[PDB]
Every structure is written in C-alpha cells, then in structure tokens.
C-alpha cells in the first residue's frame, strides 16, 4: 500500500516464578509465592533430603490450597542453599507435587526483592534468576 | 492418648492502596497467581461492567486505568464473583516491570512506588 501504519504490541511470557535452590546438595526448583502464608516442603523432598527426623509432628493443622491441605509437621530450621549462601528457613511439610514453595513468611524473613524488571530474586546477600518457561516444573 | 488445639504470629499478606475510577481499593499482591482479577462487585461500583468482554469467569476487562500514587497504570482484569476486589497477579507485575521489595516494604510498579499496607488495614 501507499502508506505503512505501525501499530506496536507487546508479547510477554508470564511463567510462574521459580528459582533453583539446593537442600542438602539436592537441586530443587522452588515456587516463589507472595500469596502463601507459609513456606512448604513436600513429604517426598523432606524424606529424600534426610530432613524427616526434623519433621516436628507436634505442629500440624491446615495449609488450604496445596495438596490435601493436611499438615504432617514443621521443620523449624533447615539450611537452604541459594547460589553461594546457606540461609535458615522453616517449612510446613505436606503431601504435594510441589517440592518447595517459598511463601511470604520466608520472603519477609530474608528481606527479599522479587524483581520482575530484572527477572531475579534478591534474597539475603545473593541474587538468583527466575526460571524460563522451559525449566519450570508442570 | 493425645489432644489437638490451636496455639496461643501470622504473616500479613501484601496489599497496596489503589484507585479505580476514583474508588479507593485495597489490592492483594499475589505472585502465586498468573492472572490479575477484579470482582464482579467492584466492576459494578467503579462503572467498568460495560467494559467486560464476554467472548470465551464473567469476562475480561482489557484496559482499565489503575491509579497508584499520582499516576495511571493500564491493566487487564479477568472478572470473577469473589470477595477479593482486586488481586494483582504475575501478568501485571511482569507487564509493569514491578519489584516486590520486602526490605523497604514497597511495591515499585511502572514509574511509581507505593507502601504495603499494615495488617490492620487488610480487608
């Protein structure tokens, strides 16, 4: 045509926020959820990583919206490796396909910045990239 | 030979103050949700019900301006019948290059910065 009109549009992928962490040298993809009141670890992962002895079965209850919601116990402290730093985290343990969900409690505790401009999570003294759609567990 | 009971501190959720068509709204900031949502009720009150696209959840609002501090930020909403009037999800946090800053307790979105609300102010 005699004239060419340019009408730009943005296309933005919106994958769920995940990061790579390590728990007792086991690589784990962790879900970053500011809408969660607690931080979760699956029974499968707690057992695999040798953290089951520290599942304190005095602390139960419900975490509605993940698995069956039935809490098995609390891991009061387990060191989580994020890049070059170990950081202490607490976990609500339940039967779920989500290995680790980092909730608002742990994000606040470690003064996190969830940076969607730069696509990274800054937590404690480290920075780690959000996973691409291809690396995200489904 | 056992008992169960509620213990004798809950983390407050992230909320911010926003205005839609001059109506003050307390918005839930949720990275666990892919999609930003607006209640049917708020769409009615703010005069956005006529902007709900119904082609296949009530529908989608494609562009509505959200006022944060002194600036307007265009957002899209999936309209549901819900108690939560606005839930800001990953789509709008990514679109507006946001930072959820828990060190300073603020949300940086588009070109503005706004404080998270106190526990007493949460809906």
Q: Where are the beta strands (DSSP E) in chain B?
A: 15-20, 23-29, 37-39, 52-53, 59-68, 71-80, 86-88, 99-101, 106-109, 112-115
Please choose, from the candidates A29, A31, A79, A34, the residue with its C-alpha nearest in 3D space to the C-alpha of residue A54.
Answer: A79
Both tokens of residue A3?
Answer: 């004239």
* Residue B45 DSSP SS3: helix
Both tokens of residue A11?
Answer: 């296309």
Which residue of chain B has the CA closest to A65?
B32
Sequence-ordered list of residues with C-beta below 8 angstroms from that of A86, at least 6 positions apart, any chain: A79, A80
C-alpha A5/C-alpha A1 separation (Å) is 10
Alpha-carbon distances of A86 from A110, B22, B56, rounded to whole Å:
12, 46, 47
* B11 contacts on A by Cβ (under 8 Å): 37-38, 103-105, 108
Please choose, from the candidates A7, A31, A11, A9, the residue with its C-alpha nearest in 3D space to the C-alpha of residue A21.
Answer: A31
Q: What's the resolution in A?
A: 1.8
Both tokens of residue B48?
Answer: 């956005």
Of A12, A34, A105, the CB nearest to B31: A34
* Residue A91 DSSP SS3: strand
DSSP 8-class letter at A50:
T
Query: What angle (nearest 5°) sits at the alpha carbon of residue A71, between those of residues A64 and A109?
Result: 80
> According to DSSP H, which parts of A4-100 are helical?
43-48
Beta bridge partners of B39: B80
- Please indicate the experimental technique that yielded this structure: X-ray
Q: Do B98 and A107 touch (CB under 8 A)?
A: no
Please choose, from the candidates B122, B16, B89, B27, the residue with its C-alpha nearest in 3D space to the C-alpha of residue A34.
Answer: B89
Count of Cβ atoms closer than 10 Å to residue A117 Cβ: 13
Fold of the CATH domain B1-123: Cathepsin D, subunit A; domain 1 (2.40.70)
Both tokens of residue A15?
Answer: 């994958």
**Direct distance between the N- and C-terminal alpha carbons of chain A, in angstroms, rounded to an integer:** 46
Please choose, from the candidates B55, B60, B68, the residue with its C-alpha nearest in 3D space to the C-alpha of residue B43.
Answer: B60
- Would you please indicate which residues of A are annotated as catalytic (active-site) residues? 33
**Domain boundaries in chain A?**
1-138
DSSP H or E run through A64: none
CATH of range A1-138; options 2.60.120.380, 2.60.120.10, 3.20.20.70, 2.40.70.10: 2.40.70.10
DSSP 8-class letter at A66:
S
Q: What is the sign of the dihedral through the CA atoms of A78, A80, A86 and A89?
A: negative
Q: A17: buried, middle or exposed (CB in 10 Å: 19+, 13-18, 0-12)?
A: buried
C-alpha A116/C-alpha B94 separation (Å) is 5
Residue B119 backbone phi and psi in degrees, to 5: -50, -40
Q: Do B11 and A117 touch (CB under 8 A)?
A: no
C-alpha A103/C-alpha A106 separation (Å) is 6
């Amino acid at each position: 045509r005699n004239a060419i009109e340019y009408t730009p549009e943005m296309f933005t992928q919106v994958p769920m926020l995940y990061i790579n962490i390590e728990i007792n040298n086991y690589p784990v993809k962790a879900f970053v959820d500011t809408g969660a009141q607690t931080t979760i670890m699956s029974t499968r992962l707690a057992k695999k990583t040798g953290l089951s002895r520290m599942i304190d079965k005095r602390f139960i209850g419900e975490a509605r919206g993940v698995g069956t919601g039935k809490i098995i116990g609390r891991i009061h402290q387990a060191q989580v490796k994020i890049e070059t730093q170990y950081i202490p985290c607490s976990f609500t343990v339940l039967d779920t396909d989500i290995d680790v969900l980092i909730g608002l409690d742990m994000l606040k505790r470690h003064l996190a910045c969830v940076d969607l401009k730069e696509n990274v999570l800054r937590i404690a003294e480290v920075e780690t990239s959000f996973l691409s759609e291809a690396e995200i567990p489904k």
